[PDB]
Enzyme design. Structure first.
Site, mmCIF file in Angstrom:
data_model
loop_
_atom_site.group_PDB
_atom_site.id
_atom_site.type_symbol
_atom_site.label_atom_id
_atom_site.label_comp_id
_atom_site.label_asym_id
_atom_site.label_seq_id
_atom_site.Cartn_x
_atom_site.Cartn_y
_atom_site.Cartn_z
ATOM 1 N N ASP A 184 17.128 -1.827 -5.109
ATOM 2 C CA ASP A 184 15.837 -1.419 -5.708
ATOM 3 C C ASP A 184 14.792 -1.245 -4.615
ATOM 4 O OD1 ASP A 184 13.768 -0.985 -7.543
ATOM 5 O OD2 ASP A 184 13.771 -3.056 -8.297
ATOM 6 N N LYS B 48 12.985 1.530 -3.933
ATOM 7 C CA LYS B 48 11.794 2.299 -4.297
ATOM 8 C C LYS B 48 11.314 3.150 -3.118
ATOM 9 C CE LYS B 48 10.358 -0.652 -8.094
ATOM 10 N NZ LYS B 48 9.203 -1.181 -8.818
ATOM 11 N N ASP C 119 8.356 7.741 0.489
ATOM 12 C CA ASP C 119 7.777 8.364 1.692
ATOM 13 C C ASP C 119 8.213 9.820 1.738
ATOM 14 O OD1 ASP C 119 6.633 8.569 4.406
ATOM 15 O OD2 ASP C 119 6.986 6.391 4.627
HETATM 16 O O1 LIG Z 1 9.038 -1.119 -13.443
HETATM 17 C C1 LIG Z 1 9.703 -1.911 -12.717
HETATM 18 C C2 LIG Z 1 10.615 -1.550 -11.750
HETATM 19 C C3 LIG Z 1 11.338 -2.503 -11.071
HETATM 20 O O2 LIG Z 1 12.224 -2.246 -10.179
HETATM 21 N N1 LIG Z 1 11.116 -3.879 -11.359
HETATM 22 C C4 LIG Z 1 11.920 -4.901 -10.713
HETATM 23 O O3 LIG Z 1 12.724 -5.572 -11.709
HETATM 24 C C5 LIG Z 1 12.717 -7.009 -11.480
HETATM 25 C C6 LIG Z 1 11.959 -7.702 -12.612
HETATM 26 O O4 LIG Z 1 12.217 -9.097 -12.423
HETATM 27 P P1 LIG Z 1 11.799 -10.161 -13.563
HETATM 28 O O5 LIG Z 1 12.738 -9.972 -14.721
HETATM 29 O O6 LIG Z 1 12.018 -11.476 -12.863
HETATM 30 O O7 LIG Z 1 10.346 -9.922 -13.947
HETATM 31 C C7 LIG Z 1 12.070 -7.216 -10.120
HETATM 32 O O8 LIG Z 1 13.065 -7.249 -9.079
HETATM 33 C C8 LIG Z 1 11.166 -6.000 -9.953
HETATM 34 O O9 LIG Z 1 11.013 -5.678 -8.574
HETATM 35 C C9 LIG Z 1 10.203 -4.237 -12.340
HETATM 36 O O10 LIG Z 1 10.013 -5.429 -12.640
HETATM 37 N N2 LIG Z 1 9.511 -3.258 -12.970
HETATM 38 O O1 LIG Z 2 1.148 11.075 3.211
HETATM 39 C C1 LIG Z 2 1.841 10.523 4.112
HETATM 40 C C2 LIG Z 2 1.932 9.168 4.347
HETATM 41 C C3 LIG Z 2 2.660 8.684 5.409
HETATM 42 O O2 LIG Z 2 2.769 7.441 5.710
HETATM 43 N N1 LIG Z 2 3.348 9.599 6.254
HETATM 44 C C4 LIG Z 2 4.060 9.120 7.425
HETATM 45 O O3 LIG Z 2 3.417 9.632 8.614
HETATM 46 C C5 LIG Z 2 4.413 10.090 9.571
HETATM 47 C C6 LIG Z 2 4.334 11.611 9.701
HETATM 48 O O4 LIG Z 2 5.168 11.925 10.820
HETATM 49 P P1 LIG Z 2 5.158 13.412 11.448
HETATM 50 O O5 LIG Z 2 3.847 13.592 12.160
HETATM 51 O O6 LIG Z 2 6.321 13.360 12.404
HETATM 52 O O7 LIG Z 2 5.354 14.419 10.323
HETATM 53 C C7 LIG Z 2 5.755 9.608 9.044
HETATM 54 O O8 LIG Z 2 6.092 8.322 9.600
HETATM 55 C C8 LIG Z 2 5.543 9.498 7.540
HETATM 56 O O9 LIG Z 2 6.386 8.491 6.989
HETATM 57 C C9 LIG Z 2 3.246 10.962 6.019
HETATM 58 O O10 LIG Z 2 3.805 11.789 6.761
HETATM 59 N N2 LIG Z 2 2.523 11.384 4.954
#
Ligand SMILES: O=c1cc(O)n([C@@H]2O[C@H](COP(=O)(O)O)[C@@H](O)[C@H]2O)c(=O)[nH]1
Ligand SMILES: O=c1cc(O)n([C@@H]2O[C@H](COP(=O)(O)O)[C@@H](O)[C@H]2O)c(=O)[nH]1
Ligand code: PRO
Ligand code: PRO
Ligand code: PRO
Ligand code: PRO
EC number: 2.4.2.10
Lengths: 256, 256
Positions: free
Chosen positions: A89, A91, A94
């Protein structure tokens, strides 16, 4: 509505989705354990004991204090033995060029061991395109976060619709959603719902809970994701069984 | 418009923002290097050589093949020597209970070495509340992602406004934004803008570029974040100097 076993055979099904749906039907489980622990030994002991009760084990590899790739080898052994998928998970959220490296590389090498990962859609479809460059060759799948369980979530209305369109336009790699409900009418897509407990309530950091009967039976989701409702219980095996039976019966009753 | 040095003294300034603004004024730099490399030695050699030219070094610790906490100790030595902040671009984007662990713990222990982190606002304010539980005691700051540089970004309109409100309501911890432009009228908030190159164009995974003159001078941002425009160049020191001079002059011209 088709059964999980019939959905596993749909023409446009992704192979990872098919494998999952077949083991859900075989084992009578639509429970995903959210293994939100910091010790490798606890992660592995939970995976072994609860493996027969779950279709999936969801990780947060970045909270594991003693992560090594060998821990993940042992987790794969248990996933194969007990027949469940591994869902990291992470998520991803970027630009495409960055997420491909975050998925393949670094210390975690997520793509090497995770059947499934997920992504936020807010950055646009490049997030999916970058992950698919690594995941398609490795036969992996991805879930898009269409709705969130937390208070103040902005994943509503047009945002949720954009997630569904992105998934449907990247069906080679995207196998479904994190959502609170059925968001796609296409039965090839999975719906996985976190924010689940048997009792009403929430946490003090914006988590909100709904019951298995509500999210599977009334809201039409496929799989419940449960962390603290199982991991904070004394007997985690019986807690998992309670959640499994709740989610499975809610599914059977909706199928009719 | 106040100078960076005057903004460093504003009554409601966060201490991390103040430190940053003072070193920007001292060094005549509003350039953040995006050190998007996979080798610790290359990260550290870039940090040492480019340190005098930058106000900030942005990391993606999860792409570093040979990460250890000792690499981060050496990076802190360089940050102190050359006077720049460390910004881990982790884009926390989960429920509050999860992100606190992802920030403090696991292998990376991000809060132990990162002056700044950032978060997506889509999950609601619990993401900030969870990070602040770890970051406030450790004297850290956080940036909220109000706008994104990638094609198809959904961080527009009401989403951007929600990010600004969240920041302004959590000013104890939130010191500014990732954005393409000035999004807050409050001068205590920083604006950092990625998607920057001297030449027009983009990448093949949804990145879009604008120039330093456009984003600092016309769009009112404070800091440019530059990866490939510097890291893919042969002479990364002269590339950094070109970007520094561009961003600094655009700032001076807008201050008038
Ligand atoms: O909408 C979302 C998306 C998630 O991944 N999660 C993830 O699912 C799990 C929820 O855990 P819990 O049942 O203990 O609240 C966590 O690992 C959290 O990061 C969430 O709770 N809501
Ligand atoms: O809106 C966003 C937010 C970011 O963190 N970034 C980050 O900034 C950097 C952009 O790199 P570059 O200049 O090589 O395209 C990357 O590390 C990317 O993860 C982005 O490009 N756009
Ligand atoms: O919210 C309610 O009232 C019921 C009670 C248990 C879970 N759902
Ligand atoms: O709301 C609460 O605090 C408890 C724990 C989750 C379910 N009920
Ligand atoms: O977009 C343009 O035309 C100019 C040329 C260099 C960068 N900005
Ligand atoms: O658009 C391109 O491909 C090149 C590289 C970034 C700036 N111009």
């Amino acid at each position: 509505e088709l059964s999980f076993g019939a959905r596993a055979e749909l023409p446009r099904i992704h192979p990872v989705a098919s494998k999952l749906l077949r083991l859900m039907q075989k084992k009578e489980t639509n429970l995903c354990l959210s293994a939100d622990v910091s010790l490798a030994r606890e992660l592995l002991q939970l995976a072994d004991a609860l493996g027969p009760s779950i279709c999936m084990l969801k990780t947060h590899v970045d909270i594991l204090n003693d992560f090594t790739l060998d821990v993940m080898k042992e987790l794969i052994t248990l996933a194969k033995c007990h027949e469940f998928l591994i869902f990291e998970d992470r998520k991803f959220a970027d630009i495409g060029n960055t997420v491909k490296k975050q998925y393949e590389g670094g210390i975690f090498k997520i793509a090497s061991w995770a059947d499934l990962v997920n992504a936020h859609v807010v950055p646009g479809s490049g997030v999916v395109k970058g992950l698919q460059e690594v995941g398609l060759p490795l036969h992996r799948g991805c879930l898009l976060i269409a709705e969130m369980s937390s208070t103040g979530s902005l994943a509503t209305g047009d945002y949720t619709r954009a997630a569904v369109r992105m998934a449907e336009e990247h069906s080679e790699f995207v196998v479904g959603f994190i959502s609170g409900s059925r968001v796609s009418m296409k039965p090839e897509f999975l719906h996985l719902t976190p924010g689940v407990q048997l009792e009403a309530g929430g946490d003090n950091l914006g988590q909100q809970y709904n019951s298995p009967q509500e999210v599977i039976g009334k809201r039409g989701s496929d799989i419940i994701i449960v962390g603290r409702g199982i991991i904070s219980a004394a007997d985690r095996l019986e807690a998992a069984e309670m959640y499994r039976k709740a989610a499975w019966e809610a599914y059977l009753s909706r199928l009719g």
